[PDB]
Amino acid sequence: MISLIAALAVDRVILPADLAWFKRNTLNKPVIMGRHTWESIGRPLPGRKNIILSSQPGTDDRVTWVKSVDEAIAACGDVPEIMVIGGGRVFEQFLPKAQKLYLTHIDAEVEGDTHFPDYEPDDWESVFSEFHDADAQNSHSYCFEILERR
Template sequence: MKKSLPLSLIAALGENRVIGVDNSMPWHLPGDFKYFKATTLGKPIIMGRKTWDSLGRPLPGRLNIVVSRQADLRLEGAEVYPSLEAAVARAEEWALEQGVTELMLIGGAQLYAQGLEQADRLYLTRVALSPEGDAWFPEFDQQQWKLVSDMPNPAEGDKPAYSFEVWERV
């Protein structure tokens, strides 16, 4: 996959790497939603069809790109591409036109696994829970990455503690 702009993966994951259950997130963290919005706003976002379905609508202020093998799929508010490579090419074209310097891959598990080896940056919200799940963030070799930022958020009421980590490929 040829690209000149960095590809970043953004995900919230439990201590057991769970990112989802029944096509939804196993927690509700308003602070993480705000962080996600601030990190992705104005940028092209690439997602799989299940992630699109879980959102229920296009995310405003971003180019929504969906990767699907379903050739005739049409989605209102999103562009559909048959492969991650084609989606990244379109995201980069749009980003360069807009003066944006980062491409965002927002899930789910299959696309994270495909995109990890091309990724330049990881925005990981580490949630202090180990919930049951059916979707996981892929394991990654921490020797190939450097933790450049770690912002802890304490538990509040029924909300677990979590931290915003940013990893960059070394």
Template sequence: MLSLIAAVDRRNALGKDNRLLWHLPADLQRFRRLTTGHKIIMGRKTFESLPGILSHRHHLVLTRNRGYPVDDDRVTVLHSLEELWEQLDPQSENFVIGGGEIYRLLLPYADKIYLTVVEGEFEADTFFPKLDDGEWEVESKVAHPADGKNPLPYTFIDLSRRR
């Protein structure tokens, strides 16, 4: 199973200058809870933006750079969709974690999407692809107000592809 997981604003903004646009501990906890123990798929820029290797997850990094150097058993560098399909675990959920180009590339193959929609509009240079409402069904939608730890209101939305 292939799932996309992302946090966006109302305009589908993801980030700017290879950084997230906000800090929401609740979203980070959800990301950790959902992706721990699974393979996570990302582009090179997203990989380089991480604070380090994310524990208890195998990183699959898509890049056009055939000589991209990574020396860590928890990371596999891939250069094509064919190589990616060979690495996915068919018995488990595999998570696409960004960035914008990788989301666009893999959206047609996705079975589920886990979105965090942050209330507001932010200056951005990277966006999540627009979804066709006819292709996706909302499984759950839970709104959360801003609080002492999370400075912005946000909504968790889980979507599944209509069959």
């Protein structure tokens, strides 16, 4: 089953507490990302099969390069759950096939260009929500949400 995971600020623009959330829900799962996202981490996410979706030939043999959504899905094989970690245009392509959304709602206004897709709230069931206030380590309030396609 295909899952999307992302941290969303004001206007769905894409807090150390999110890193443990991301790491826990992606460990030992294949991760599908865009090229811009791949250029950001610089090296593959440890303990996870890294798949990059790009129309251009690959330039790093440490990860798995694919040129379409269906090729990215096939590259994962038969696994319990596939995680898509962005960015925005990659999220848009995998949203119609996604059955789970791992959203971290961060009450923060940041300057951004890219946004998480405008998913239809009517089509998603909130199966998990966990609200946290800001503290000495997290400068904003944040809510860990998991939604399942209806």
